[PDB]
């Protein structure tokens, strides 16, 4: 009588979608009733959707999902919909027609826009407190940027609001680069490397992340070309990244609850196998069926609360 849930992974080399990978997976372990089968996408919709045809082959009663291509949602959904099972997606969030176009869809992640403010508002603390940082003493802030995956929420999102605040703070900004580094540190790391080898490298006073995996990449160039000087912001708290906010490498972060997203997609794809109400026993505040986990600015002076 073991209920079966199946459950994808965009990437498992994801250094965020990892932590939650595990976590969802000890979750699990305290469902004696439940299995999960897990699967890794490696990074590869077209693998991910051939993983689901198989989990619904063998008679999964949820999926838990967290998509390779956002824009993936629709396909998805009509897989599902074709075995009548529900779907909890998680941490790429489908666009809000997509989530309405099938009852049982929900979705379980982050108020995204608030990790953007909150890297943009504790910038904005350090670079008032360290005037030092602006080199060329103009008033404003030379950025560098590096962008999760273009279209990605999170992506999107922290990377308007990041500058969105500092400017909303009265703090100008100048973005000598933005690119994609699509979440990963070595691509992170040759990105930075390269405009550090430019000219006007110079001119670069901040580097500005989209997560923290970017962020060390970054911490390895800096350190690489001794600009080590420079300071570096991330997002997501990962312990290697909280080790680096100790040693100064990174001067801030924010914390994306891993735990509590793992928690919550658990806890909703559980009872929709069961036929129950998605938060049934739980409390869990869906919004028209999102749950939304909030984000923590990090730096040294919190770092032990
Ligand atoms: O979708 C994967 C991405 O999710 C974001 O919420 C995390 O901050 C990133 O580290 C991760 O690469
Ligand atoms: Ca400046």
Redesign the pocket.
Known sequence: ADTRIGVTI??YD????SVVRKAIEQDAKAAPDVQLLMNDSQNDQSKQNDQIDVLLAKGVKALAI?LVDPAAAGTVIEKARGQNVPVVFF??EPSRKALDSYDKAYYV??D?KE?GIIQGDLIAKHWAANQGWDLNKDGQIQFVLLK??PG?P??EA?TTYVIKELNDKGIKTEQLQLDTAM?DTAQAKDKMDAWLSGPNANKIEVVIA?????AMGAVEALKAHNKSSIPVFG??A?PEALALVKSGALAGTVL?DANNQAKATFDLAKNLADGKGAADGTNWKIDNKVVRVPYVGVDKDNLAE
């Open positions: 965009y990437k994801d250094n965020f979608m967290n941490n790429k992640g982050t995204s990790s999760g995956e990605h999170d992506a922290r979440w989209n997560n923290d995996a970017m997002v997501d990962l994306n």
